[PDB]
A paper describes a structure:
Oligoribonucleases (Orns) are highly conserved DnaQ-fold 3′-5′ exoribonucleases that have been found to carry out the last step of cyclic-di-GMP (c-di-GMP) degradation, that is, pGpG to GMP in several bacteria. Orns are highly conserved DnaQ-fold 3′-5' exoribonucleases with a DEDDh active site motif that degrade short 2- to 5-mer oligoribonucleotides in 3′-5' direction and release monoribonucleotides as reaction products. Removal of pGpG is critical for c-di-GMP homeostasis, as excess uncleaved pGpG can have feedback inhibition on phosphodiesterases, thereby perturbing cellular signaling pathways regulated by c-di-GMP. Removal of pGpG is important to maintain the pool of free nucleotides inside the cell and to prevent mispriming of transcripts and is brought about by Orns.
The structure of Ms_[name] in apo form was determined to 1.87 Å resolution to a final Rwork of 17.9% and Rfree of 22.2%. There are four molecules of Ms_[name] in one asymmetric unit with two homodimers packed in a side-to-side orientation. The overall structure of Ms_[name] consists of the typical RNase-H fold of DnaQ-like exoribonuclease superfamily of proteins consisting of five central β sheets, β5-β4-β1-β2-β3 (arranged in ↑↑↑↓↑ direction) and nine α helices, along with an additional C-terminal helix, α10. Although the terminal residues 197 to 209 of Ms_[name] lacked any discernible density, a significant part of the unique C-terminal tail of Ms_[name] (residues 181–196) could be built and formed the additional helix, α10, through residues 186 to 195. α10 of one subunit packs against the other subunit of the dimer in a “handshake”-like manner, creating a small flap over the other protomer and is unique to Ms_[name] among all bacterial [name] structures. The C-terminal helix hence provides additional interactions for dimer formation by burying an additional ∼1000 Å2 surface area in Ms_[name]. The catalytic Asp9, Glu11, Asp110, and Asp162 along with the general base His157, which are characteristic of DEDDh family of exoribonucleases, are conserved in the active site of Ms_[name], as expected. The carboxylate side chains in the active site of Orns usually coordinate two divalent metal ions for substrate binding and catalysis. In the apo form of Ms_[name], we observed only one monovalent cation, K+ ion, that was coordinated by Asp9 and Glu11 in all the chains. The 5' phosphate of modeled pGpG interacts with Ser106 and Ser133 of one subunit and Tyr127 and Arg128 of the other subunit and constricts the active site of Ms_[name]. The catalytic pocket of Ms_[name] is also lined by Glu11, His63, Val59, and Met12, which prevent accommodation of oligonucleotides that are longer on the 3' end of pGpG, as suggested earlier. The “handshake” conformation of Ms_[name] is hence a unique native conformation that aids packing of the dimer and also regulates activity through access of substrates into the active site in both in vivo and in vitro conditions.
Author numbering:
A (entry chain A): 1 to 154, 158 to 196
B (entry chain B): 1 to 196
Write the structure that this text describes.
């Protein structure tokens, strides 16, 4: 029951939903214990030269240096095809609609582009998301040693792998050992709240 | 200084960023220990009858029953004024831009409307957010007893009451799913990081 997390990372020409284009999407599925269930999928999505010419210089330099911009010019994959490839990959692991949450770092940004451009993928995923950066920001306040001790971080598919490693790290440090507290302790705490 | 969490909940005519209107916004600031730093602020934002008439029946019924729809009709507050009232409230507690994260349940939805309609508020908050529902969904898998033991929610469907429920939910997870402070040793943390 509920043994899949869908990990997605996107790259864009920028973060403005009124004008920027989605140019890369990667997907990996894990079980609930963060074991990777397959090799996943990453797709570079075509954007025309006019769209790419709108990138601010910091993003232009980043996408030039990673080789993404040249891959975008050479891509023959449109939005609808990328959506079908990602959703078919997910449906191989996730059997029910509106069950699997989207997981990643600052995943709301990626979900904004998916909602705009990939409505079928948006509708298939649970509306709830697992933002690893939510846990990062809580540890930053509650457990500074955990925040400063994060494993070192190194394109969509590599970013996903690092998000999974960061959550594994928080599970092992910030979260209680299974099975967690007693049913009576839980009841007492809930009662006060 | 990283104490402060900014808690915001919005109400809308619907969740479609192409057409729906933001009709209520509430804000509370907490310290890092989730103590409320003031009484906060909630503002009903005017929308015209044409916009309100586009609400699907389940949303129409929710906003009718809470009194929100009638408060919207009577409101003289526009988006720019609501944004200024919320941002002035936050700036009383949060001294630096791009420092305080936005906190709530499924807070991405609210942030989407804030980014569209309130660019100054959007820019003042950290881009990072604390989604209490992220913790809920992790506990649902890792600690079913914690997930099923959550405190009962009032379900006011009004911005300020919803914020209070989000804070109580995070207090509940902090007391159950998270290790007692100060947590594991620097050496234990290093050993775990090394394996990953
Ligand atoms: K990215
Ligand atoms: K709400």
């Amino acid at each position: 029951v509920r043994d899949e997390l869908v990990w997605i990372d996107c790259e864009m020409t920028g973060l403005d939903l009124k004008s920027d284009r989605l140019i890369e999407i990667a997907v990996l599925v894990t079980d609930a214990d963060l074991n990777i269930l397959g090799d996943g999928l990453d797709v570079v999505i075509h954007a025309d030269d006019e769209s790419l010419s709108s990138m601010v210089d910091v993003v232009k330099q980043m996408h030039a240096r990673s080789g993404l911009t040249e891959e975008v010019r050479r891509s023959t994959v449109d939005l609808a095809t990328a959506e079908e490839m990602v959703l078919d990959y997910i449906r191989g692991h996730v059997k029910q609609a509106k069950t699997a949450p989207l997981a990643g770092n600052s995943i709301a940004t990626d979900r904004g582009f998916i909602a705009r451009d990939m409505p079928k993928l948006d509708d298939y995923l649970h509306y709830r998301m697992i933002d690893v950066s939510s846990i990062k920001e809580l540890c930053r306040r509650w457990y500074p040693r955990i925040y400063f001790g994060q494993p070192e971080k190194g394109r969509a598919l590599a970013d996903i792998h690092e998000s999974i490693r960061e959550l594994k790290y928080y599970r092992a440090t910030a979260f209680v050992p299974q099975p967690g507290p007693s049913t009576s302790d839980i009841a007492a705490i809930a009662a006060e709240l």
